[PDB]
């Protein structure tokens, strides 16, 4: 079908900012009819998404005049002409010329801010835990930004992948930072195997990984 | 005053069919289509399909033919979508929306999730320094929140007396059983000289648990 590529996936902005949103569909969007259904809709955390603007350039009633779109051909364009606060949350476009109906895969508009390192934080699994015969081992990488981070399990100095629970909070109403939590999931008996835990955090803050480790010998 | 109200959140076995339904108001049902998204966390939103009420027809997207069925009773004017044979693959939240020259109006979601799990308390472990590590000027405490049903659970850190400082990292689905963590950081003059607590509450099992946060070996 008719893919929809939105760009950026990130838009960090300060307030007051103009800010401008790239969808380009896979091909012509001009109906056998004469018109061309490519749409911009707003989603807020836990809300419904909301249309901003239907057919390329008309703005929905009762969205903000700040809004408009326009283009043709493979490329369209969302403007918002200063970034207020209403405005922060997922931007995406849908296409309704062909079936099947297809999405853009959204942008997140975001407050800008200076990086931040993660605060690094492993654990091994709880004694409380140990006695049930599960072996979770857990990583916070607090207060970071931009939220782009990639995290790394290493079980004697040995990549794991498998197990693995990745989970972020949207960005802080005072901080503008992320945080997110990793937990690596093995057996008593698997964990009992090995030494060395690690878990390794890869951001743009630095070059190479801020690493955090234990040995089970020694917790 | 258009608006789509749809019904209430299910909890599914596997192999279940689920019905969801989308009562339509303020406009004239059959003028307009009714739209059915699948909005799935990692995924972004995928396009079922859509009906016109009283017309007879129907556009599915193909790989929903045969587990997605649109009905649409201009009597009531309620759309209705059945999906058979669920899945984990089907736990999301999905959406109906007007549809004719934009998705204009969208209904508040449905959230489906689907699992062979009793209601289950969650298992509470304490995540706290040890293995012999000299903890800094602050220091970061957890509790991980293991292995519940059915959603919602409420972390709070001694009372909710912190100014947080916490972080709630949103719960994740994974073999039919959530997940979520809950971090706080406090000076190190505070813990573990005083007590720091964290109270889980699972409403759904009638259950509160409180650790209190000590350290997991020497420090
Ligand atoms: O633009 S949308 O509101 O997503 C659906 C448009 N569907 C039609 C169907 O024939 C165009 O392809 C117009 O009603």
């Known amino acids: 079908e008719l893919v929809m590529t939105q760009s950026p996936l990130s838009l960090p902005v300060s307030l007051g900012d103009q800010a401008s949103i790239s969808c380009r569909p896979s091909q012509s969007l001009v109906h056998s009819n004469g018109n061309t259904y490519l749409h911009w809709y707003l989603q807020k955390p836990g809300q419904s998404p909301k249309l901003l603007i239907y057919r390329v350039s008309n703005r929905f009633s009762g969205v903000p005049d700040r809004f408009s779109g326009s283009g043709s051909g493979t490329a369209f364009t969302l403007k918002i002409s200063r970034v207020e606060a209403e405005d922060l949350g997922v931007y995406f476009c849908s296409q309704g010329t062909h079936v099947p109906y297809t999405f853009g895969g959204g942008t997140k508009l975001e407050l800008k801010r200076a990086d931040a390192a993660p605060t690094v934080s492993i654990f091994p699994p709880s004694s409380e835990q140990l006695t049930s015969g599960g072996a979770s081992v857990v990583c916070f990488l607090n207060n970071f930004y931009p939220k782009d981070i990639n995290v790394k399990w290493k079980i004697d100095g040995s990549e794991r992948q498998n197990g693995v629970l990745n989970s972020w909070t949207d960005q802080d109403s005072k901080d503008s930072t992320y945080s997110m939590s990793s937990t690596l999931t093995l057996t008593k008996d698997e964990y009992e195997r090995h030494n060395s835990y690690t878990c390794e955090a890869t951001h743009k803050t630095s070059t190479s990984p801020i690493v955090k480790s234990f040995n089970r010998n020694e917790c | 005053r258009v608006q789509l109200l749809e019904s209430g959140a299910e909890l599914m076995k596997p192999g279940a069919s689920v019905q969801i339904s989308c009562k339509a108001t303020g406009y004239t049902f059959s003028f307009y289509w009714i739209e059915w998204v699948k909005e799935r966390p990692g995924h972004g939103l995928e396009w079922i399909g859509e009906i016109l009420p009283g017309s007879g027809r129907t556009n599915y997207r193909e790989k929903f033919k045969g587990k997605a069925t649109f009905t649409a009773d201009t009597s009531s004017n309620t759309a209705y979508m059945q999906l058979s044979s669920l899945t984990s693959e089907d736990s999301a939240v999905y959406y109906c929306?007007?549809?004719?020259?934009?998705?204009?109006?969208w209904g508040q979601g449905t959230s489906v999730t689907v699992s062979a799990a009793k209601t289950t308390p969650p298992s509470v472990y304490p995540l706290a320094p040890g293995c012999g590590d000299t903890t800094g000027s602050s220091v970061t405490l957890g509790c991980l929140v293991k292995g519940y049903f059915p959603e919602s659970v409420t972390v709070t850190w001694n009372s909710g007396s912190l100014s947080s400082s916490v972080h709630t990292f949103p719960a994740l689905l994974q073999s039919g059983l959530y997940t979520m963590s809950s971090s706080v950081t406090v000076p190190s003059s505070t813990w573990p000289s005083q007590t720091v607590t964290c109270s889980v509450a699972h409403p759904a099992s009638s259950t509160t648990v409180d650790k209190k946060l000590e350290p997991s070996g020497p420090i």
């Open positions: 929306t007007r549809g004719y020259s934009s998705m204009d109006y």
